[PDB]
Amino acid sequence: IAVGMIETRGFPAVVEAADAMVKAARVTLVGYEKIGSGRVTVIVRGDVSEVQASVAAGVDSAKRVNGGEVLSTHIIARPHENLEYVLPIRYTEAVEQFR
Amino acid sequence: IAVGMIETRGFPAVVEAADAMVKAARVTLVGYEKIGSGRVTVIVRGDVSEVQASVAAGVDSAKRVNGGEVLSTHIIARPHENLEYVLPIRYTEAVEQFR
Amino acid sequence: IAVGMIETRGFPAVVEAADAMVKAARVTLVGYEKIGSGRVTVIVRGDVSEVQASVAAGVDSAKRVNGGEVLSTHIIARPHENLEYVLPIRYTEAVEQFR
Amino acid sequence: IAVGMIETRGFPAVVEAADAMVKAARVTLVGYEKIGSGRVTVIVRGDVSEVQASVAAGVDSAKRVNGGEVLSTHIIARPHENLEYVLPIRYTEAVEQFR
Amino acid sequence: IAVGMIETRGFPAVVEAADAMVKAARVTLVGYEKIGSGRVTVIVRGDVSEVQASVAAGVDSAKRVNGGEVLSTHIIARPHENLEYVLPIRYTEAVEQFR
Amino acid sequence: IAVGMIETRGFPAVVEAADAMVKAARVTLVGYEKIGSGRVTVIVRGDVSEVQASVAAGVDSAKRVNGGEVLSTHIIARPHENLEYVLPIRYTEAVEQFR
Amino acid sequence: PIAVGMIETRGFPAVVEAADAMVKAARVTLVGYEKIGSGRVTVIVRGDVSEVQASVAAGVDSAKRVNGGEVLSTHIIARPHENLEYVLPIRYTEAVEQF
Amino acid sequence: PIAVGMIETRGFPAVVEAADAMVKAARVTLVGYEKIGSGRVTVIVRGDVSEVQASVAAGVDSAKRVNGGEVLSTHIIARPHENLEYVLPIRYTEAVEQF
Amino acid sequence: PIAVGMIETRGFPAVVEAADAMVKAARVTLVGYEKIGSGRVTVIVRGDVSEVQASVAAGVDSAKRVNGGEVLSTHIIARPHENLEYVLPIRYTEAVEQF
Amino acid sequence: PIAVGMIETRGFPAVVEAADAMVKAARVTLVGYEKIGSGRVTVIVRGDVSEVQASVAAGVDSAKRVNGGEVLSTHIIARPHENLEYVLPIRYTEAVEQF
Amino acid sequence: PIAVGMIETRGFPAVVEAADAMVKAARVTLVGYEKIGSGRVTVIVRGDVSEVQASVAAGVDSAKRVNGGEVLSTHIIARPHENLEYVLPIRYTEAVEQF
Amino acid sequence: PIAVGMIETRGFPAVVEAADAMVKAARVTLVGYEKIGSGRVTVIVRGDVSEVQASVAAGVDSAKRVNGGEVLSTHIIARPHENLEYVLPIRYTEAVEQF
């Protein structure tokens, strides 16, 4: 299951990115990551094609935000299982209860 | 229920943004978010039209603050339910006890 | 009860701001807030006129600090009750035991 | 057992770095480290030659990321045991359960 | 009892500031404060004249540090009791056990 | 017992600094400190002459790191006991179990 | 009015059955679960007075049928004073709210 | 003077009834709830001496009527020494203050 | 439907045997372990109703064979109400999910 | 010398009365309160040996008068070894220090 | 196969002796220690089945010789299901791994 | 060799006396204090075997003289396996180290 990420500078924009992503295709927002310098990432999981659709929409929508800025984005089609155990890209408890 | 966000650089300004928002219309301040680089966001919930009124007032009032600066703002009319589970835009425990 | 805020860049200056505020008038320092980028805020509560007196003194005294810098300030005469529940402007446990 | 590190500015890029590293050779991603200013490090362990292979791939892949930036990298062939006890380069609980 | 503060950019320098302060006069280092942007403060308590001696020595010694930088300093002769309850300038548990 | 400190900008470099320090002479790495703005410090303890040897090696090795940068360094020959109680320069639990 | 209903059991299995029988028998929300020792645990439900009475009755009959089941005490409070919400686990949690 | 009133029960339901009966019978504030094992739990109220006496009496009569209810001990302290506030859960909390 | 199965024992060793026998005897997942005092502990499993019945039966037979083993109570809930998931440790955890 | 005095009760109300009677009967400071199960709780006071003896005696007489009161054990240590301070809740806390 | 061995005692001293006797009598690793109330505590060891049997036997003989020693229950599981690792303290910890 | 000595009491006051008598009677360090329920608590000391024997003996005689004192179990382990240090509170803490 692919992973999609949009990193913005600013919180409002990251929230819009996430909203646009889950609305554009069949992906689950699994988390959000702060790393400082105003950089925040929203992470979604789903089929590669769903994730591609969601990230493209997420980027477009975030850039429309008043003062919105997208810093980086990336999609990994088949993330190695090891990552699930170290980085915050896994379906969380709260998350799978929403499903 | 819509979500409204004002991100400022500086705490005093974000506090004013929040005060102005809840006073301008029928919205509930549900939280506050720090992301570093002096960037803080206040988040309100309510009817889209209430939120529109509150954000416009929040922006005007924050800009009047001595040294106040607004970095970004955004309103999402119908935030996807998935967001409530990942991002800090949900009515909190403390919050719904105030209601 | 009004809320007064002085945000400085630097800790020594914020400590002086707070000392000057509680000494200048009848206000209670209720808290302190860090938001990154060296930005820290001290928050006091009291009658609007007391708070006005305290913030003016706090600003003057903070600017006298060696390397002191004031970034922003603001006073809200009647902060909405909703804020008390979300933002760190409320009388705390430790605080009301000092009173 | 060698330690390999790639530090990026941006989260998406660090996630790609990690994915590329564990896919390129026989290394275990043991952790991730945030230090502010958007600087994040992913850490892998394995035979020196595996780690060399993984870091080279991790760097190439991270630089291909949209808005990806690599700040620093380093490999230590035989890290002193003392480090395992202070710095986050050790196999963690969650990690060795994945193995 | 007076409070003395030296804020540096850099940790090594703040550690030297503290060492120099407690060695120069009869003051107790009561704490250390991080506020981001590399800004850290060391706080001492003691008689105003002891604190004056310690801060002057602390500044001189910190500036001798390789890459040492002092950002701000301040002394408050009779800090208001209210501050003890909000800001980290109080004798701590660990601290008074050293005494 | 002397204290030695190397502060870098970047995590990989600080890890190398630490490795080089404990390998160059008879010192114990006792901790690591993050203060933001990418500034991290590694702290060692040992005889002044051991610490001098370790810091010199730590600096040389950190500067060889790809993208490595050393911001500041310092050695305190006889750190005042008060510091042990406030600043993170003390032998920790985990640490003395390694010994 | 919105009553609170409580069933206390000796043993966890029996208390889980009480809870399941309570929310199934009537229009009530399980809001809490309280451990106090001696194998005594309480499930707390909220709802209309008549709904809570229906559910507590169902809860008790079912719990007593559990193998090694044992009900210690029960009680229904019709109009719980607001003060209680703030001290005891009878209040709704945002957790059980989202649901 | 401002007395403290305590009812200790065996069982949680009975202690919740004690609390509800206490704050309802007189001008007192429930400030705490204390678990100590063996199924023993205490509700603590604050108020004038005469108010606390009225409420403790109501509390006990009501608690004994709870199904499987059982009161273990009670006590009213008329002028609790200030020292106690700082060690025991008899003090008001900002939680119960806001209310 | 997806039932929940619970075995409560007196003693930890016996409860660990119950759990091991349960997941081995049928298609069930151990999702929780609950301590409530008096030496009473519960293991909770999730699975189809028929699978959970098979496993609880195996669990009980095995637990009673443990040296100093002792089963206090057991229960199977066929269709646990969703409300319970949110209050009690019967829900899957991302921990047991990854597995 | 500075002795430590302890009264252990069965029940919380009685232990709160012990504490109140102790600090009122003599020049002692309540520094701790210890829960260990089976409804056993201890109040610990510090002071001169003769002061602690006066207070423990008062404490016991008063505690035994509490409704459902019960004193389990008491003890006075005249010169408690410094080692104990560091392991047990007999030491002053900055909490009780500020007072 | 890698079995798990458990000795549960009444009393801590006896459980510490059990653990010491177990790891000394055979090739096993103490991985956990479990408190569940009523003075019942368990030590858990991991190792080959034959090694764990040797150690549990040694553990029990030694524990029964402890003054006021008392063994409540014991059990050896030869092939503990992987599910258990994720719910119970039978798994290795990085703590006991480093050793 | 460096033995561990343990005295377990019923009641806290008696356990505090045991500890005080132990460190006073011989060259031992109190390193821990363990609560396990049923009013059972253990004090743990470290030292030479002969020193620990002297202290445990003193500890027991003194504890039995405590009003309402009661010793449940004791034990001395001459050469505690290193594995134990990592699982149980018999290890020195940096807390008791600094002293």
Structure description:
- Twelve copies of one chain form a homododecamer.
- Chain A is of the alpha+beta class and 99 residues long.
- Chain A has one domain: 2-Layer Sandwich (Alpha-Beta Plaits), CATH 3.30.70.1710.
- Helix content of chain A is 41%, strand content 33%.
- The first copy, chain A, has four helices and four strands.
- Chain A has helices at 11-24, 48-64, 81-84, 93-98, and strands spanning 2-9, 27-36, 39-46, 70-76.
- A four-stranded antiparallel sheet of chain A has the order 2-3-1-4, covered by helices on one side.
- In chain A, strand 2 and strand 3 (39-46) form a beta hairpin.
- In chain A, helix 1 packs across helix 2.
- Chain A starts with a strand and ends with a helix.
- Chain A binds chain B through residues 10-16, 18-19, 22-23, 28-32, 34, 36-40, 42, 65-68, 92, 94-95, 97-98, and chain B through 3, 5-7, 33, 35-37, 39, 41, 70-74, 76, 79-87, 89.
- The PDB classes it as structural protein.
- Keywords: Bacterial Microcompartment Fold, Shell forming, pore forming, structural protein.
Question: How would you concisely characterize the structure shown here?
Answer:
The first copy, chain A, is an alpha+beta fold and 99 residues long. Chain A contains four helices and four strands. The radius of gyration of chain A is 12 Å and the shape is globular.
Give helix % range of chain A: 40-55%
What structural class results from the helix and strand content of chain A? alpha+beta
C-alpha Rg of chain A, in Å?
A: 12 Å
- Look at the structure and name the CATH superfamily of chain A: BMC (bacterial microcompartment) domain
Subcellular location (chains G, H, I, J, K, L): Carboxysome
Domain BMC (chains G, H, I, J, K, L): 3-89
Pfam families (chains G, H, I, J, K, L): BMC (PF00936)
InterPro entries (chains G, H, I, J, K, L): Bact_microcomp_CS, BMC_dom, BMC_shell, CcmK, CcmK-like_sf, CcmK/CsoS1_BMC
